[PDB]
Design a binder for this molecule. Structure first.
Ligand code: E07
Ligand code: E07
Ligand code: CL
Ligand code: CL
Ligand code: CL
Ligand code: CL
Ligand code: CL
Ligand code: CL
Ligand code: CL
Ligand code: CL
Ligand code: CL
Ligand code: CL
Ligand code: CL
Ligand code: CL
Ligand code: CL
Ligand code: CL
Ligand code: CL
Ligand code: CL
Ligand code: CL
Ligand code: CL
Ligand code: CL
Ligand code: CL
Ligand code: CL
Ligand code: CL
Ligand code: CL
Ligand code: CL
Ligand code: CL
Ligand code: CL
Ligand code: CL
Ligand code: CL
Ligand code: CL
Ligand code: CL
Ligand code: CL
Ligand code: CL
Ligand code: CL
Ligand code: CL
Ligand code: CL
Ligand code: CL
Ligand code: CL
Ligand code: CL
Ligand code: CL
Ligand code: CL
Ligand code: CL
Ligand code: CL
Ligand code: CL
Ligand code: CL
Ligand code: NA
Ligand code: NA
Lengths: 468, 468
């Protein structure tokens, strides 16, 4: 009798989302193992008939064998997450029909998956929203693919200024944020807290212009994106992900820039104890520790600001002590409200969350801001009541390698002479600490001080500043 | 006394659009000449003050000198084009306010510019729409940047099938053609004649997927495009051009794939006869002769089909004998009707044409289809009445190197066994000659026979075909 087990070895089942997800993954491990065992090359595995046979053999091998498949799943925590979706699932329903949901709770030090929600109720709808459904991750792409990489590359600090003035995509359409064609200059923090789009667009433009290897970063974390030239990439255009994959992206940021590959299987043993597969840790430093910890600091304010999510309010009411753990995170909303995301970390754990409809019809405007935030607050609470120390009380903290520059609030760059329409001008004014992940820190102030912006934009902004 | 002259040496003027365009270009030649004459490096020319001085010196040098600046402009033809815009300009006005216009008539063998229209009336509006205004070239980008390059690369023949089924951009928006989300499979000819967008989008996707050096082509013709990853690049997203530059793109196609750099100055001589600048021909084979001549054949049908332009009807009425020259061309329309283009070639000459408003407000829906077509028909007529043999009576003809494959109408690929949902199936049916620019011609028919298309798309199309 083969058995799928929780991480402590309690038996899940002899050989619902949990069963079928872990069994499908075990079948894939068994496939690789049998193929190598029989000396079938990946040249021969190119053959559909050979491949099919080996898939069948893998499945029957588990059925008939006496294998012990040890998963990473924590019984108590995964059972708490099931009861939480059962009990509080209905908080998602927002007047647009029944809302579907996926969640993945991941250990930031190992990438092990401790439990997950695959959906509202397997018995009514079997689609697995944690591992199978691929969806645009919307604005939760920004910290990873735009600002994170900019910061990593010495192209941006914590208090850098970005343009949020009006501007068009290549196709001539305006870049929108709900009904706003935009505003003016803003700090990176404000851009993150509001999730404005134009500042993200300019950041990614800057990366392209500099020929930064964005793919090198994203592929290290296991993302597959077919076109890196897409302008709205940081807003979720041209990227689709499962919740488990995307959680692994936030795991990397939470773990001080060090990726660990997600997994639900830690080991498969034959009846006699032969280890036929075992997870092998392959840690990767995807962002510098300076970058990661700078980003942790920005993402803490995302949640504490409560601009795009009610989550910290919902949590503080449910569980004030837990709300005082060091929560960081980012929300996402797709352009027609088709996908809402909330990704959450403490230094120990990352919990990813998606809601949406299976046929891609729209959620209500506030599904992500309010409903998912409340559901995920109840989820988080449930996890903690199951395993009181699991989230931890550690804080995220800036790595010793972070560089601190004193920069003008108004420019995000150092006080200096700047040439402004003819005149060289002493740019002076009140300053602020800005965090950087390069060697030298922030540049001296320049005329084009901000990330992006047209000539008109700068004339408007300099006029403004020049009122000293 | 310095003098700007027509190509025969008749004096234009001692030292309006014509005057200022040729004088500005002469100033730039004089700038390079004086800088080299004084041994100022391009390192020193990096200095703004040195640069400014040298620009001033160039201008004063012409003023005070005795230089003879010989332009490529044909007096009679350029004077006919002025009278044509004066007399028939008003045909552009379409109920959206006064419409602006730019035209450039180019010799396909030399790239010499024989005359141009800079606008409706210099005296009312000085903007130079032939040489200065940069605008999206819309769907006239397709032959150059999508199908041309696909054909060049052995990825497409004259009767290849493309998908025009419904599909979304990376941002999740549908690809539109006016109010159509699209249709089904279609030939390359139909795609060109209608200017459908989805088939163009898939072609460019295919290029990106294959890592084709699209930039290598476009830069050879002197285009500057900042982001080659833009999905709507073939529809004019992310590209802006002057009329003179874009004419040079159609010159390359008309001249059997061989680029000649556009120019309005052929020579500058000092009073004593010293040749201080002279145009130097640097011909480049940008597309194979097979490709170019295949494309000539497709673009002839664009005009003869009269789907997107009334031009051949307007011309046949004005001048039936001239309408029977071998006209090929492409129209362009931007998404809000802001820019309309019509590019025209005979084997001898290429005439480019743009209309639009200076502040970018919309034209009427039919400004490009009807009004510009009629204006340009009158322009063409005027040019011919000035210089009766200038357009020539030669035909475009397929180069001996073009490969001819007999392919199924339905697939654009060769008759063959194809695996269709289980069954291998004998795909048979009526065939057609398809032109190719590779060594081997069209592949055998495959399941995914068309450029682009989803799994659903192919199921719909194969079902259809399978009705033998
Ligand atoms: B992102 O925050 O997911 C970003 C790309 N989202 C939007 O632009 C969006 C989609 C749908 C409705 C509104 C918005 C803007 C918005 C407004 C308030 C908070 C977050 C996003
Ligand atoms: B192309 O033909 O310039 C292409 C990208 N144009 C359009 O999609 C367009 C823009 C504005 C209005 C309509 C259309 C579609 C269209 C309809 C008939 C003929 C040509 C273009
Ligand atoms: Cl499942
Ligand atoms: Cl489950
Ligand atoms: Cl066996
Ligand atoms: Cl356990
Ligand atoms: Cl996954
Ligand atoms: Cl858009
Ligand atoms: Cl990249
Ligand atoms: Cl992915
Ligand atoms: Cl790329
Ligand atoms: Cl696994
Ligand atoms: Cl996994
Ligand atoms: Cl055994
Ligand atoms: Cl580091
Ligand atoms: Cl808070
Ligand atoms: Cl709140
Ligand atoms: Cl649904
Ligand atoms: Cl609760
Ligand atoms: Cl420091
Ligand atoms: Cl400092
Ligand atoms: Cl540095
Ligand atoms: Cl920038
Ligand atoms: Cl500007
Ligand atoms: Cl001019
Ligand atoms: Cl003129
Ligand atoms: Cl001199
Ligand atoms: Cl002349
Ligand atoms: Cl030009
Ligand atoms: Cl769009
Ligand atoms: Cl390219
Ligand atoms: Cl250009
Ligand atoms: Cl590129
Ligand atoms: Cl020139
Ligand atoms: Cl020129
Ligand atoms: Cl002289
Ligand atoms: Cl050739
Ligand atoms: Cl005709
Ligand atoms: Cl007609
Ligand atoms: Cl105007
Ligand atoms: Cl006429
Ligand atoms: Cl042949
Ligand atoms: Cl053949
Ligand atoms: Cl070949
Ligand atoms: Cl394809
Ligand atoms: Cl499909
Ligand atoms: Na958001
Ligand atoms: Na058109």
């Amino acid at each position: 009798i083969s058995e799928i087990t929780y991480s402590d070895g309690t038996v899940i089942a002899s050989i619902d989302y949990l069963y079928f997800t872990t069994l499908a993954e075990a079948q894939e491990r068994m496939y690789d193992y049998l193929a190598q065992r029989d000396n079938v090359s990946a040249k021969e595995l190119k053959n559909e008939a050979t491949q099919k046979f080996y898939r069948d053999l893998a499945a029957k091998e588990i059925e008939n064998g006496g294998y012990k498949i040890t998963t990473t799943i924590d019984q108590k925590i995964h059972s708490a997450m099931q009861s939480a979706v059962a009990d509080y699932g209905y908080l998602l329903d927002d007047g647009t029909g029944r809302v579907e949901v996926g969640n993945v709770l991941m250990d930031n030090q190992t990438g092990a998956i401790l439990g997950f929600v695959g959906g509202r109720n397997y018995q009514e709808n079997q689609n697995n929203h944690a591992f199978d459904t691929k969806r645009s991750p919307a604005s939760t792409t920004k910290p990873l693919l735009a600002y994170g990489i900019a910061i990593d590359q010495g192209l941006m600090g914590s208090e850098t200024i970005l343009s949020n003035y009006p501007t068009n995509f290549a196709n001539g359409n305006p870049i929108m944020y709900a009904n706003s064609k935009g505003t003016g200059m803003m700090t990176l923090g404000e851009a993150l807290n509001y999730s404005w789009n134009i500042p993200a667009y300019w950041t990614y433009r800057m990366l392209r212009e500099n020929g930064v290897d964005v793919k090198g970063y994203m592929e290290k974390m296991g993302y597959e994106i077919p076109e890196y030239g897409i302008e709205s990439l940081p807003m979720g255009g041209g990227i689709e992900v499962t919740v488990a994959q995307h959680t692994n992206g936030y795991q990397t940021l939470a773990n001080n820039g060090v990726y660990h590959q997600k997994h639900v299987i830690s080991k498969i043993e034959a009846a006699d104890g032969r280890v036929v597969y075992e997870y092998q840790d392959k840690p990767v430093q995807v962002y510098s520790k300076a970058t990661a910890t700078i980003m942790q600091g920005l993402l803490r304010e995302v949640l504490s600001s409560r601009v795009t999510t009610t989550f910290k309010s919902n949590l503080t009411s449910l569980n004030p002590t837990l709300a005082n753990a060091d929560w960081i995170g980012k929300t996402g909303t797709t352009g027609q409200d088709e996908n809402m995301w909330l990704m959450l970390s403490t230094p120990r754990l990352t919990l990813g969350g998606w809601i949406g409809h299976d046929d891609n019809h729209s959620l209500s405007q506030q599904a992500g801001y309010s409903n998912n935030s409340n559901y995920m607050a109840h989820l988080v609470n449930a996890i903690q009541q199951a395993s009181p120390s699991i989230w931890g009380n550690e804080r995220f903290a800036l790595d010793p390698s972070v560089v601190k520059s004193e920069v003008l609030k108004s420019t995000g760059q150092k006080p200096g002479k700047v040439s402004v329409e003819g005149k060289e001008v002493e740019v002076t004014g009140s300053t602020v600490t800005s965090y950087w992940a390069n060697k030298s820190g922030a540049p001296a102030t320049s005329y084009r001080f901000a990330i992006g912006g047209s000539d008109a934009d700068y004339q408007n902004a300099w006029s403004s500043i020049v009122g000293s």
